Design a protein around this ligand. Structure first.
Ligand SMILES: Nc1ncnc2c1ncn2[C@@H]1O[C@H](COP(=O)(O)OP(=O)(O)O)[C@@H](O)[C@H]1O
Ligand SMILES: Nc1ncnc2c1ncn2[C@@H]1O[C@H](COP(=O)(O)OP(=O)(O)O)[C@@H](O)[C@H]1O
Ligand SMILES: [Mg+2]
Ligand SMILES: [Mg+2]
Lengths: 602, 621
């Protein structure tokens, strides 16, 4: 007589028309009845899941009209509100199937409820005691995916005296005993296991560990962010891979027997896969609105250091990056789309803070010395290169390495790294934009020698880098006076003068906090490409460069420089937020190139 | 089940086994021993198509069918023994078994992935490798314990689901109200890991029983037709019970479409008048991201073609593969060829070289050469490959077998792999001072490599412009014609021509013999490429060229091609001249060039009696 046939599978209680849940049942069943013609029948029939969006419930429909206490009821009652979804879905599907069959029996299985898009993001560092049995939402990554192992929830028992076996709903995988059995009459007991009947049901299981991101609160303490475990129940699993960005919503429960000493873990209820605020967008449009965007971004990376315009311009070009080419998709053989810059010069010129600032202004960065690391450190043993994926991994004291030189040629060029244990496959991606700074072999670099012997580098590693700036320290008069004035005041046309600041004006720098949010927007919403006009200049430059330097003595010029020029011309299209290649765009990568090339070998 | 159903099923199996399986049962009867074990192999598709009812009754309860078939085999054996004419060299045996095979190709019965929890009681087929192996052990089955308080004995059995334990009975099945080890079997434990080629995969703990013991090996492909069941564990109060998934084996295999063919004969029947057009089309599709460089692209295909192994009777075996090495200035495309060839070949391992330790190049655990059996391992940065390791590969590169007795174990392993190498010419390269001087590699090692191609960058004003336009204009595949070829087509092509076995001829070998005799001393005979191993490779390359053109009979054309290619390989000192590999482009017409090459080759080496026959053949086509 009960309209809901699947009552036994659902809530285990004697059917009485007195519980307050009935009104919610009708409200939810009406809501699902009106909105029924948008769901694929087969997917729900096979894998029980109704991806109900919380925005639709929040839209002020009959769900709130009949009862306004929906958010409070959901938060306070984890299961009572949640299983009403399953009740309504089961009833609506079974009545639809009955109507369809009658027009032209039904044993539909259990359907789970899935509620996602929960707006108040209660992040970690705030769930200690109070958040017990309260529906919340999380956000993090995955690092500890484990194996599978089944478990039982409704395994059956044997009966005493007469027959009428039963299928006691054992709770959360904890063995118990039926001290009473309903049956018709007489005594209970019947304490015997019958783990062969089809009454027993099993389902999968999993365990996931989440490490919460950098977020904010950049404390100097080296305390790792707290980690909380996750548990997948059914129809899930194999939905995650080590390394993601996932949002998880689920009930918070307390484990046992890690003895009244327990820990905290979350049972998952819905999983998503893969954001800037409106104010962030407004700010980036105002930043784009500046009349001279290149000066403001090249003279704000590090304001303490005076001078060295071209090196800072090169660092700014490196920070953005270029485009990735996936030509010939069937085989691809992808080519890297990031530059690599090495700085060599006399000591005392300050080539150790232009890199610290660059590392600071980055979505993901890492700074490592050249003496505390070995081949096992830079490479995989998780090396420094892996941690600097989609970022910069600037290395200091490059020249002093003498044994790890031949350890990164494969990594930086192949755009991937394999296992270091006999090379038995198991490759992992490693995208880096290595920036290195070093000093000559004999301290100060004399001006009357050959370039090759003053660097202690072979022809293989010297050609990989796009730009190798050479800096000199000469005793001028005006420059030293200005530098002394600046360094005491702190304690109280070619592409070289248009960037220099004439005293008598304000060049107020952008805060690094705002500039950090700019690179992230730049690197994932604009894909530049070369234009027909600009390619002619690069081709002409390559043609007179090769024909001139093929007879003289210098580093051999391979086809790598042609690709590097394209990469750097693409680089000067993401700083201004454009997708083109103007003639001036290609002309600006010629003057910079003439600071390690021909313009310098003399 | 119903009473008549099992009777009809048993009748069906006994009729089938009596009609199609007389020879095997006759052989089984005529064996020594009385009660050890004896299996019978029976196909499934034939009996499935014979009667439509057996399949439905089978693939829903795959438990009673095996017992029914065992009973049918027993009654068939009894009937044959009764109707026997030579009751002298025969023996009756009480232990028979069933082993079904030949399952259909339905998608839900040939699943490659381990079931999660949904397949319990379903007959499945899985494939994979072997990792671990247990020891041979003996179980106890049935006890027939002493009778207490009653008379009739009890024949209680064991249970598989409880790790082979015995439950104490108390309710006797006696009619009245009165209610109160010379048996052995076999056992083993094996772990199966899913293959990665057809995909990290997890492991399957398969359990063997009876004759299946001592029938599998660590490191081989397996195919088991077994049932999936669950194993429990003793219950503890207020804890999480543990379960597991296992696979009881019922049969084992030691295994290790005409459309594709019809397309291939269509392709190499259309190109009948011009035979070299097909070869040009084959070579053009190799690494199509690079312009020009005909000779190196032909050499890569020839090396990847392979050869045949020929082992002598008693102990010896000779090499049947080939190896290649490239030298040239940086920025010519060496890494691209290795990367592209690492994908076409079914099994290949990519390693860094100097970044690879001694555990990979040799045995430790499996390294790189042993792990790349019947494949191709690419080698990079050969300049300073840890000289000890660089020299500890002479055994395995030439004898195709490692022979190590480290720590007093005496273990022997097989490794058959074609090695591709590319190293930088340390020091400024010179036209003179042959490779042994520029790269400074030992003469013994600079003899096992078949072809050594040298790449040099020189002064030109045309190739630079062409390559600049190629890079800048992004003109992928300038031949806009839609011939191309897909990567899967190339993979099938190079995975199918490995089955042909060409045979030598008489219009062939004479040319190679005369060439070798002439080259053995012209005026300098180089210094290391004039040993006996030169002719051992001149045959392996000429044979390999014949397997790329869909035939099994070597002719004059293959010999001429291989001689020209290998003569061009030897830089500097030669008998015709040296041509740079990079400055080479696809000819517009290959027939005229082939005719000119044949006319040039067959004059100074006196085989003019064959030139007339060759020109007569070429004219009449
Ligand atoms: N243009 C400059 N303006 C202000 N300070 C400078 C400048 N150039 C160098 N310095 C000073 O030099 C120091 C950096 O030394 P540096 O040259 O990086 O050492 P190394 O040569 O070992 O890398 C800084 O503390 C900085 O105060
Ligand atoms: N013909 C060509 N067409 C296009 N690109 C080429 C060509 N030849 C060389 N290259 C470029 O040169 C690079 C090959 O470098 P390579 O010489 O293999 O390095 P290594 O000397 O370390 O082996 C490739 O990235 C490719 O883009
Ligand atoms: Mg420093
Ligand atoms: Mg290389």
């Amino acid at each position: 007589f009960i309209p809901y046939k699947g009552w036994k599978l659902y809530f285990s209680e004697v059917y009485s028309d007195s519980s307050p849940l009935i009104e919610k049942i009708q409200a939810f069943e009406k809501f699902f009845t009106r909105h029924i013609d948008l769901y694929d029948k087969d997917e729900i029939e096979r894998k029980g899941s109704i991806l109900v969006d919380f925005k639709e419930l929040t839209e002020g429909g009959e769900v709130t009209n009949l009862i306004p206490d929906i958010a409070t009821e959901l938060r306070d009652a984890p299961e009572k509100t949640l299983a009403c979804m399953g009740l309504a879905i089961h009833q609506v599907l079974t009545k639809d199937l009955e109507r369809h069959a009658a027009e032209l029996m039904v044993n539909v299985p259990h359907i789970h409820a899935r509620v996602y898009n929960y707006e108040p993001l209660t992040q970690l560092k705030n769930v200690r005691a109070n958040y017990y049995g309260k529906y919340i939402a999380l956000r993090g990554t995955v690092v500890r995916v484990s194996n599978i192992k089944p478990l039982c929830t409704k395994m059956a028992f044997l009966c005493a005296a007469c027959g009428e076996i039963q299928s006691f709903p054992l709770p959360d995988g904890k063995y118990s005993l039926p001290t009473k059995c309903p049956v018709p009459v007489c005594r209970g007991r019947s304490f015997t296991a019958l783990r062969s009947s089809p009454l027993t049901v099993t389902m999968d299981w999993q365990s996931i560990k989440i490490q919460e991101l950098m977020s904010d609160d950049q404390r100097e303490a080296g305390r790792i962010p707290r980690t909380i475990e996750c548990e997948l129940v059914h129809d899930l699993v194999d939905s995650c891979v080590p390394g993601d960005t996932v949002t998880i919503t689920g009930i918070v429960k307390v484990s046992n027997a890690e003895k009244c000493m327990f820990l905290l873990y979350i049972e998952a209820n819905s999983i998503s896969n893969s954001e800037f605020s409106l104010k962030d967008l407004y700010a980036i449009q105002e930043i784009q609105a500046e009349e001279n965007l290149f000066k403001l971004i090249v003279n704000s990376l590090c304001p303490v250091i005076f001078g060295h315009e071209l090196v800072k311009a090169g660092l700014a070009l490196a920070l953005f990056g270029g485009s990735q080419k996936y030509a010939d998709d069937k085989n691809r053989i992808p080519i890297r789309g990031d530059p690599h810059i090495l700085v060599v010069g006399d000591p005392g010129l300050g080539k150790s803070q232009m890199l610290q600032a660059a590392c600071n202004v980055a979505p993901r960065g890492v700074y490592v010395c050249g003496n505390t690391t070995t081949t096992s450190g830079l490479t995989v043993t998780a090396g420094a290169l892996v941690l600097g994926d989609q970022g910069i991994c600037g290395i200091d004291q490059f020249d002093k390495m003498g044994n790890q030189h031949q350890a990164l040629l494969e990594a930086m060029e192949q755009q991937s790294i394999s296992l270091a244990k006999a090379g038995v496959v198991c490759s992992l991606p490693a995208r880096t934009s290595i920036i290195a700074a070093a000093n000559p072999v004999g301290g100060h670099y004399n001006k009357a020698k050959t370039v090759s012997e003053n660097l202690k580098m072979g022809s293989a590693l010297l050609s990989r880098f796009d730009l190798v700036f050479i800096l000199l320290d000469t005793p001028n008069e005006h420059h030293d006076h200005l530098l002394s004035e600046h360094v005491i005041a702190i304690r109280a046309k070619p592409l070289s003068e248009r960037l220099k600041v004439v005293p008598g004006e304000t060049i107020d720098p952008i805060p690094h906090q705002l500039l950090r949010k700019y690179i992230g927007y730049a690197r994932q919403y604009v894909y530049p490409r070369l234009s027909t006009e600009a390619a002619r200049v690069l081709q002409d430059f390559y043609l007179e460069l090769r024909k001139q330097s093929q007879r003289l003595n210098s580093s051999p010029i391979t086809t790598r420089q042609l690709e590097s020029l394209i990469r750097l011309t693409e680089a000067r299209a993401r700083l201004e937020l454009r997708e083109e290649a103007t003639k001036e765009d290609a002309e600006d990568i010629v003057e910079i190139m003439k600071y390690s090339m021909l313009g310098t070998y003399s | 089940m119903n009473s008549d159903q099992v009777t009809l099923v048993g009748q069906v199996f006994e009729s089938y086994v009596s009609e199609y399986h007389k020879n095997d049962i006759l052989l089984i009867l005529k064996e020594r021993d009385e009660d050890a074990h004896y299996p019978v192999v029976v196909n499934a598709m034939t009996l499935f198509e014979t009667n439509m009812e057996i399949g439905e009754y089978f693939n829903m309860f795959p438990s009673e069918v095996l017992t029914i078939f065992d009973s049918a085999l027993r009654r068939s054996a009894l009937t044959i023994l009764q109707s026997l004419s030579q009751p002298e060299a025969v023996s009756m045996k009480q232990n028979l078994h069933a082993r079904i095979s030949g399952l259909p190709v339905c998608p839900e019965l040939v699943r490659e992935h381990i079931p999660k929890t949904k397949d319990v009681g379903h007959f499945l087929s899985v494939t994979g490798t072997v990792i671990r192996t247990s020891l041979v052990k003996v179980l106890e089955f049935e006890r027939d314990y002493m009778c207490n308080k009653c008379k009739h004995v009890f024949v209680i059995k064991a249970d598989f689901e409880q790790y082979y334990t015995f439950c104490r009975p108390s309710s006797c099945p006696s009619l009245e109200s009165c209610d109160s080890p010379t048996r052995c079997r076999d056992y083993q434990e094996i772990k199966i890991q899913e293959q990665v080629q057809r995909l990290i995969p997890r492991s399957m703990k398969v359990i063997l029983e009876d004759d299946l013991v001592d029938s599998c090996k660590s490191g081989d492909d397996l195919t088991i037709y077994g049932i999936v069941m669950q194993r429990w564990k003793p219950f503890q109060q207020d804890v999480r019970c543990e379960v597991e998934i296992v696979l009881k084996a019922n049969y084992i295999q030691v295994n290790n479409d005409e459309e594709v063919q019809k397309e291939f004969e269509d392709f190499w029947e259309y190109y009948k008048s011009d035979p070299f057009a097909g070869r040009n089309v084959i070579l053009a599709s190799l690494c199509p991201q690079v312009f020009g460089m005909y000779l190196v692209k032909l050499a890569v295909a020839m090396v990847l073609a392979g050869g045949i192994q020929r082992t002598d009777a008693t102990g010896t075996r000779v090499r049947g593969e080939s190896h290649l090495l490239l030298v040239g200035d940086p920025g010519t495309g060496k890494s691209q060829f290795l990367k592209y060839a690492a994908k076409i070949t079914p099994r290949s391992v990519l390693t860094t070289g100097i970044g690879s330790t001694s555990a990979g190049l040799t045995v430790t655990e499996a390294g790189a050469l042993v792990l790349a059996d019947a494949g191709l391992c690419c080698i990079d940065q050969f300049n300073s490959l840890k000289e000890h390791d660089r020299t500890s590969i002479h055994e395995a590169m030439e004898q195709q077998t490692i022979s190590v007795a480290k720590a007093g174990l005496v273990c022997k392993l097989n490794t058959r792999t074609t090695i591709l190498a590319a190293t930088n010419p340390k020091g400024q390269y010179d036209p003179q001072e042959s490779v042994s001087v520029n790269i400074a590699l030992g003469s013994p090692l600079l003899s096992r490599f078949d072809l050594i191609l040298v790449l040099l960058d020189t002064k030109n004003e045309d190739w630079d412009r062409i390559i600049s336009s190629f890079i800048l204009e992004n003109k992928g595949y300038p031949s806009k014609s839609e011939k191309l070829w897909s990567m899967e087509k190339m993979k099938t092509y190079f995975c199918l021509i490995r089955n042909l076995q060409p045979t030598l001829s008489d219009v062939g070998n004479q040319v190679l013999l005369r060439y070798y005799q002439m080259q053995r001393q012209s005026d300098c005979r180089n210094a290391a490429r004039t040993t006996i191993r030169l002719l051992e490779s001149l045959i392996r390359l000429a044979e390999a060229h014949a397997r790329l053109m869909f035939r099994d009979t070597v002719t004059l054309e293959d010999a001429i091609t291989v001689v020209s290619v290998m003569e061009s390989s030897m830089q500097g000192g030669a008998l015709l001249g040296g041509v740079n590999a990079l400055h080479t482009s696809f000819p517009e017409n290959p027939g005229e060039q082939y005719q000119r090459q044949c006319e040039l080759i067959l004059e100074k080496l006196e085989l003019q009696s064959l030139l007339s026959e060759e020109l007569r053949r070429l004219e009449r086509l």
